[PDB]
């Protein structure tokens, strides 16, 4: 089994333009959305079929009530922040919590806040402390650190409860999350410029989206032009990596593709 992650986001927008919700919260297992909630629906509902089939109506009613209060909480904290900054108008407040179950059985945990797209407060579950970015953040830090039992509860949730949810959700959708579709890799060449030939290594139809593709001349690694891992829309992903050929060079290039613990080499 490879590395998996659970994530919960929160987006707070003061003075939102009509149509944009004041509060949005989405959960993720790896790259798949699993839950959703906003201030317009005021209901928490699943975003994946294998989440609705395995979670009783009890789960969604309980967390609909919980997030309604969290939405209220997020409003006053953002209002408090704008008060401290003496900020008017629209500003954003963000929060992300989650954990990862690494491949070797190891675990990680994180809890961060953001104000206007910048790192605001980062939690350190080892030292039981909050990393503050500026003076107003440090004011929030001292208030949160005064509640020592809360830091412990968050440490326990990150290291124990979050991982418990992650393993549970992995089993619910193991057909989607733990599957493997290897990439279809093809190397082609085109003359972009006069006297300039380019080699293109293109991969598509692979899942999970985690993939790394490099070009290698002989045994060494010039600069390599990379393409982003883009979602194809059918559940798979695509990416590419290109290089510029030296025509007088008698060297041989080869595309290397690694995916789900499988290394692949395409000589030219």
């Amino acid at each position, epitope marked *: 089994m490879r590395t998996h992650s659970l994530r919960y986001f929160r987006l707070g927008v003061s003075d939102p333009i009509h149509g944009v919700p004041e509060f949005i919260s989405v959960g993720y297992v790896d790259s798949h959305p699993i839950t959703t909630y906003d201030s317009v629906t005021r209901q928490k509902e699943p975003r994946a079929p294998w989440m609705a089939e395995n979670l009783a109506p009890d789960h969604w009613e309980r967390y609909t*009530q919980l997030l309604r209060g969290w939405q209220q909480m997020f409003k006053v904290e953002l209002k408090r922040l704008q008060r401290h900054y003496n900020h008017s108008g629209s500003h954003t407040y963000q929060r992300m919590i989650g954990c990862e179950l690494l491949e070797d059985g190891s675990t990680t945990g994180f809890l961060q806040y953001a104000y206007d797209g910048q790192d605001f407060l980062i939690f350190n579950k080892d030292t039981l402390s909050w990393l503050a970015v500026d003076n107003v953040a440090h004011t929030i830090k001292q208030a949160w650190e005064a*509640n020592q039992h809360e830091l412990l*509860y968050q440490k*326990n949730w990150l290291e124990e409860e979050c991982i418990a949810w992650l393993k549970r959700f992995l089993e619910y959708g193991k057909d989607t999350l733990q599957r493997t579709e290897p990439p279809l890799v093809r190397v082609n060449r085109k003359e972009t410029f006069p006297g300039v030939t380019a080699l293109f290594c293109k991969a598509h139809g692979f899942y999970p989206p985690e993939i790394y593709m490099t070009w290698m001349k002989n045994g060494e690694e010039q600069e390599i032009d990379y393409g982003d891992i883009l979602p194809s829309g059918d559940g798979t992903y695509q990416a590419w990596a290109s290089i510029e050929l030296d025509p007088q060079s008698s060297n041989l290039y080869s595309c290397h593709v690694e995916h789900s613990g499988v290394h692949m080499v395409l000589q030219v």
Partner: antibody
Amino acid sequence: GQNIDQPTEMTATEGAIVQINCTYQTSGFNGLFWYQQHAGEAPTFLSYNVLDGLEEKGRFSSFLSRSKGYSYLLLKELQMKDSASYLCAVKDSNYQLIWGAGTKLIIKP
Amino acid sequence: NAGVTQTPKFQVLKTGQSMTLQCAQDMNHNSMYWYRQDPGMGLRLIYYSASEGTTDKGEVPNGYNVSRLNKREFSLRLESAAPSQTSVYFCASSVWTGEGSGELFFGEGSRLTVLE
């Protein structure tokens, strides 16, 4: 389903030491609470444990073992006022509070 | 702060009667709860108000109703009393329902006795 077990009643003599055990089987764990409730009055908060270890505030101590699903409330230097019912409560994975039936502590003079 | 005050301290009703329990806290808490305490069992949640603008049923909500009038007040109501509703009703308030380490603050308690 979710279960919490306290001894129904315990008796000790003043000046001594009593230990009230609390074992719990819950769906997830977000902390264990101890509450004191005197006869005919309101429960008041005593302690909170979410990590393994022993927390001590004054004559009262609270220990937690998440592995064994076990906790105890330790009262040192017993006094007649300590005679009360002691409530054990656990928060489950959905932050719901499961309550034990409570332990009626009786202090003999 | 005055804590949590609930009324009435005592009450006796006939089976058909209706009655409302009042509760309010001045600690600017956002969570409000209504428990009932009975011999030989832990506290049972009747209803709770996680925030100012929402309530939900608890474990034993049959025969009860609540109305979070505002952030400061929570009221428990019985439109048709029952001998089974003879109990001691406690009102609690927490700072936030979501935060895990938060404790409860209880009211003095209301003793109800319903007779035929």
